Ligand binder design. Structure first.
Ligand SMILES: Nc1ncnc2c1ncn2[C@@H]1O[C@H](COP(=O)(O)OP(=O)(O)OP(=O)(O)O)[C@@H](O)[C@H]1O
Ligand SMILES: Nc1ncnc2c1ncn2[C@@H]1O[C@H](COP(=O)(O)OP(=O)(O)OP(=O)(O)O)[C@@H](O)[C@H]1O
Ligand SMILES: Nc1ncnc2c1ncn2[C@@H]1O[C@H](COP(=O)(O)OP(=O)(O)OP(=O)(O)O)[C@@H](O)[C@H]1O
Ligand SMILES: Nc1ncnc2c1ncn2[C@@H]1O[C@H](COP(=O)(O)OP(=O)(O)OP(=O)(O)O)[C@@H](O)[C@H]1O
Lengths: 579, 445, 445, 112
């Protein structure tokens, strides 16, 4: 009985129970059975992607077999899971494993009721150059009963039959696929007592639902049975630790924290501190963003939609930041990331001046099949696979070549971002920002520092001249970055010096910062041009103030309360010591 | 070589048998084989012969399965096999249809008369080949007959495009469609005209799935490279798993809808590839294989006509203007391409009335799209809101596309704010300044 | 010490025997055998010598089989063997033909004795190699004599192409064609003029099957890939699947028709290879084998001449007009290529007279190709439907293509819908107004 | 070997052992042995467990060599072995360090 030395008697296990319940797979089972009930080509296959119930089906049919819920032909049949050592026990001496394979088929073929094999991984037999290379040992007898149910993913399947050509003329593919979200829940429910027993915890029914929905909207690279079950099992393990520490899987908190840990995506965590969350961010940003509350609110609005689920699952929120050059809109994208992730450097960004029709799409998403370089994902999906929710930033997107600009439509809506190798990324809870200086021409009208009605349409005009309407009409919001003028820049300078103090290495020296009109004007006069915007306010602060005082610090001429003043372009700040 | 000297003496009469290319790998790697054996080519039987074969085998199947097989069944299998199972030779393909159909009878009986006929087989074939035609579900003819109204409920107007497609479908269902000529269309007109949208709805209608579609974006093409994106490369060059866009899709879903976006932007060599597809369907593949996509429906789109459709010479495009559209087509695509299009269809410019209807449908789609049944409108301004959207979105050169954007910006962003600030719970309504705005339906509900 | 130390002393005189490939795999690895054995070259004999050998062996065959063999039969076999069995060295090949021919007689002998004449030998060669010309199918002269007729009933117009091809066939059948120059044609003409249609109908005629053709989409041939696509890669590179599209077909179907679709698009590197194939015939494989295509008919197609044919200067293309076309083919292709073509044929315009006949053919083929060859037409309106189609389908500069499309647009599209609605069994009819339309069968079916 | 299965019904109890790798070979080679024997996994001890083992054997080595062993030395042997002898399992690796070290002490002591 060679079979008993290599295979697992699934029937015996089923006879003894020790199997999971099988949920919703009745039709895959019916099809499997129907093929097995055939006169000749009774060789069905369970085919799809990993983690979709392919072996569940077998436990299922094993149970149907035990209970005679099968056709006459199968009523008394038995089933064995083989593979494994059948191909490797014969580690030495030519023809040894071949003899086993044959002996097994002989054992199966003769007399002993109807025996059905289950091949878990038919691709492992493959037919490695045929010429007696394992899989090739079968075909001679595929008509001679020796019924067998196979299993393989579509990639594996395609590889086998393309290279072989006979198996696809001998076997009956049965599509096996992930369940709907509700069906997934039913599955999770069916396995619920298994996990509850092994971990000693309860699972809320709503946790099963959350895991099913979450998996569908969280893990694009894992099929629902495994994906949702892992969310359940991983969560159960976490709960078991809590149980042991001194419980159940909490739909909201166990699963959300587990998910937050596993991947991130702020939306899946959603903090309960509503009094401040999604409120305070505008104030935090206001300090960074002086005057331009309009941009803050535009962003904050999208952020608020993603939280609590108002945002559309297939529409990553996205903005186009138009405006006065030097407006500070890039830092805004980082400061938003600051709030969103408690990480200003979470983002992925692309220098769009590097883009050309000759290569840009591949620089962004990676090259395709047969071409040099497999840096799949290029600048972008290469990184999305690690941080699906990171903020995306397109520096000077206005300079991006129009073809790659068009590819970026995927970020804006119908979020099926793909990779050059024919793979799918899928973005949802991912805020995307693109930048342009087109609004500068209208902001520079100076008709109030705030861009006004009508003039903002002139901006849209400039935008239509550079961006296709196909892009523009799909942006969550197009935001215009206004003139800061003297009032904002006086505040920006006071603020920049403050914010620098807080981050100026250590608070050992401290500042007075009494700029007085002299230094406020220096920074606001020889700095903030409308076309350089705030860029020079920071540069003069660093080039003249932080630098000269730093040099005095290095000489140990400064001990306490540093001040700022000017010579009176010769002003150049030029600050005294503070020893 | 044990057989070698033996066979050379005329002893051990040996009868061999193998595959064309297996043979190649033997004799061209041996020489002696060619000397030792006399190859005899075995022909593939004609359809007529195939039926005779099936008939001859019929009693073996009837006995095994416990079923009766009618002669029309035998014929049906041979006919369907030649047309719908191009990757398997007739002696098997026809038997597979008979054998499986018979098994279907056996299964049906045991799952709870036994006469196999043409419908038995046709349904079976559909299950195995995916060809919907052969389901022969005549009670569903209502949809096929009225698919024009069904498509018109999703897209507005553009009836000529709807009718053109409807006939592709009806011809296929009737079996009258030319067995070698995939349906082919070239959709011309303004962006926002519904060209792509229609193709999606066709895929929708045929398989109840807009993602059933296989999309090829012609803007990614380059005549120096891109042919291989569709059909792959040949043996030797880096990469394989060939033809991600066409070969590797068409061998799995022959009955799918192909969509080639912006074919006017395709570089000429790709347009040249299309010629196989649009003629006979025998699209070759880089690894020396064939596709035979005659069961396919192919839609291509182009904006060349934008030049004349925006002449605004009637919303429904008239002669001369339409012919100028064809002018642009003829001055761009070679006639070799154009002559393979079943119908070149020029879309109409949307009328204000169409825009109104589009707004209604589009709002319907948006409302239906929500996964949470709080997220909806009552609108109020039952005409007025829609007229705002039309007045402010009726573009003679962007069509309906701005209706989508207008709604997203003036209505949905206001909704986003309202969700964010909890100013809206459900059943939202619309009002207008001077500048459409939304009303507040706060945490009262 | 297998043999070696003894051989080195003049002990054990050994006579060896091996092929070049074997020799190389032994000697280049062993070293000592290179000196132990004293290599003697044995050349393959001439045909004359082969026949002498056959004469000597003739009595061994006559006695074994109990047949009588004619000396001319022996000559015939040696000549045939050289020409049709290039993969097997002449002594063997000649004997195979004699022995098998005798066996042919022997099989008949047991069921009925005879002699083995030249005609018998020729049949045998055809039995083993296809090469229909050796069947000496004199009773089929009728077809060869009238194949022009038959082709003209499939293809309207293009009489020059038909005559040209027919002559290739006749020369091959008559044994007049040059064993080293596979007949080849280059068809220039308007799209829709029937270039590939003729080629397929020829394969149809020759093998009773259009699918027999070794179709090569030569238009899909960029420089770096194109040759290997057809010949396969050489040793030491990914994919040792020798032959790509051509070797793998030519070695099995040596008497086949090759078709190159739009050779004008093929990169010149391809054409460069084809130069040998088209003349001399020794196309070789990427692995170093010689195939020999000389028993094939090669048809190449292109559209360069379309630019002048569209001038309407004659139905049959006129002098000068033809030269404009030849100008273009000479400008585009190297003369090295053009000179090797057996003939360049410029297709005629499919005149309105032609469309009248074409309409008939297409309507018939449409019925013939139905799977459900039940649902035939009655048409009615023989003259009016014919005229409607003849007029509306006459887009002369698109050849017959528009017609096919017209019929599809006016008849089949409607038919399909009527079928979905069960309004038609068969004997479908057409009405016309002013616009051609279909009627219904009141009796649904 | 046939005597075993043949007579195995009469109790004749046998206890045996095999390496994980060898078990695989036993099963594949005979079959009946898998059916007749109860496979038992035997665990590798943790460092903590290993030290307890070493302590039990400590007096054997002290006596055998005539030297003393510090308790921290036993701990060290097990801990050190876990980090620097990845090719040898702890039940042995720790002892190798103890026995070799004890010998090193006795060896040097009892040299010329
Ligand atoms: N009804 C079910 N019965 C058993 N397992 C199920 C069922 N539904 C989902 N599963 C999950 O699927 C797994 C096996 O099913 P599935 O076939 O999807 O995996 P698989 O891909 O077949 O396994 P493999 O990678 O070997 O093809 C189980 O381990 C379980 O987690
Ligand atoms: N309205 C604003 N929005 C954001 N940041 C601003 C604004 N006004 C001033 N800033 C400040 O300006 C600086 C950011 O400048 P940034 O590098 O974004 O210039 P930019 O205008 O984005 O250049 P680009 O024309 O490529 O977008 C920051 O220090 C930021 O605090
Ligand atoms: N006639 C119509 N009925 C309903 N919706 C329409 C219509 N025309 C356009 N639309 C809207 O336009 C959008 C897609 O339109 P369309 O197919 O015109 O894009 P497109 O212009 O084809 O893109 P492309 O210019 O690449 O083909 C859809 O969201 C759809 O709602
Ligand atoms: N003279 C004719 N007689 C019968 N059928 C014809 C004729 N001319 C064209 N056809 C029809 O046209 C189709 C193929 O035509 P044709 O050879 O003109 O294609 P083609 O234009 O050569 O393609 P290509 O422009 O690449 O050569 C066939 O289906 C055939 O029925």
């Amino acid at each position: 009985e060679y079979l008993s030395k290599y295979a697992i008697d699934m029937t015996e296990q089923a006879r003894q129970g020790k199997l999971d319940p099988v949920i919703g797979r009745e039709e895959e089972i019916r099809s499997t059975i129907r093929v097995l009930a055939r006169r000749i080509k009774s060789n069905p296959c369970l085919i799809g992607e990993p983690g979709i119930g392919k072996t569940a089906i077998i436990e299922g049919v094993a149970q149907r077999i035990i209970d005679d819920d099968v056709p006459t032909i199968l009523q008394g049949a038995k089933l064995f899971s083989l593979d494994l050592a059948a191909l490797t026990a014969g580690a030495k001496y030519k023809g040894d494993f071949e003899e086993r394979f044959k002996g097994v088929l002989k054992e199966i073929e003769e007399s002993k009721t109807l025996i059905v094999l289950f091949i878990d991984e038919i691709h492992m037999l493959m037919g490695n150059g045929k010429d007696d290379a394992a899989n090739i040992l079968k075909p001679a007898l595929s008509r001679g009963q020796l019924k067998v149910i196979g299993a393989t993913t579509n990639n594996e399947y395609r590889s086998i039959v393309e290279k072989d050509g006979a198996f696809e003329r001998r076997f009956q593919k049965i599509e096996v696929a992930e369940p709907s979200v509700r069906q997934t829940v039913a599955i999770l429910r069916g396995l619920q007592p298994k996990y509850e027993i092994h971990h000693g915890v309860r699972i809320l029914d709503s946790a099963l639902v959350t895991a099913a929905q979450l998996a569908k909207r969280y893990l694009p690279y894992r099929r629902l049975p495994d994906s949702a079950l892992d969310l359940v099992d991983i969560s159960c393990a976490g709960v078991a630790v809590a149980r042991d520490s001194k419980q159940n899987v909490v739909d909201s908190d166990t699963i959300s924290e587990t998910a937050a840990r596993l991947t991130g995506i702020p939306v899946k965590k959603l903090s309960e501190s509503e009094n401040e969350k999604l409120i305070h961010m505008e104030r935090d940003l206001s300090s960074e963003v002086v005057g331009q509350m309009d941009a803050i609110k535009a962003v904050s609005n999208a952020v608020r939609l993603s939280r609590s689920g108002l945002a559309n699952p297939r529409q990553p929120a996205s903005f186009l930041f138009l405006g006065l050059s030097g407006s500070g809109k890039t830092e805004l994208a980082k400061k938003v990331a600051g709030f969103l992730f408690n990480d200003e450097d979470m983002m992925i960004r692309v220098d769009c001046s590097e883009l050309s029709e000759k290569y840009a799409v591949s620089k962004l998403l990676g090259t395709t099949a047969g071409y040099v370089g497999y840096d799949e994902g290029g600048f972008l999906t290469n990184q999305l696979q690690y941080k699906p929710y990171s903020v995306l930033l397109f520096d000077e997107v206005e300079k991006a070549h129009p073809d790659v600009l068009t590819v970026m439509l995927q970020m804006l809506d119908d979020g099926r971002i793909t990779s050059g190798q024919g793979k799918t990324i899928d973005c949802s809870n991912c805020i995307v920002i693109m930048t342009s200086n087109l609004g500068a021409e209208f902001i520079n009208s100076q008709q109030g520092s705030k861009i006004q009605e009508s003039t903002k349409n002139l901006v849209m005009g400039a935008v239509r001249q550079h961006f296709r309407p196909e892009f523009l009409n799909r942006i969550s919001s197009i935001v215009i970055f206004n003139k800061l003028s003297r009032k904002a820049i006086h505040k920006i300078v006071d603020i920049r010096l403050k914010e620098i103090e807080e981050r100026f290495e250590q608070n050992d020296k401290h500042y007075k910062l009494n700029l007085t009109q002299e230094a406020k004007d220096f920074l606001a006069k020889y700095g903030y041009s409308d076309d350089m915007g705030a860029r020079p306010l920071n540069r003069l602060i660093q080039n003249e103030i932080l630098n000269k005082l730093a040099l005095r610090i290095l000489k140990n001429e400064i001990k306490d309360k540093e001040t700022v003043n000017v010579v009176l372009e010769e002003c150049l700040e030029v600050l005294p010591n503070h020893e």
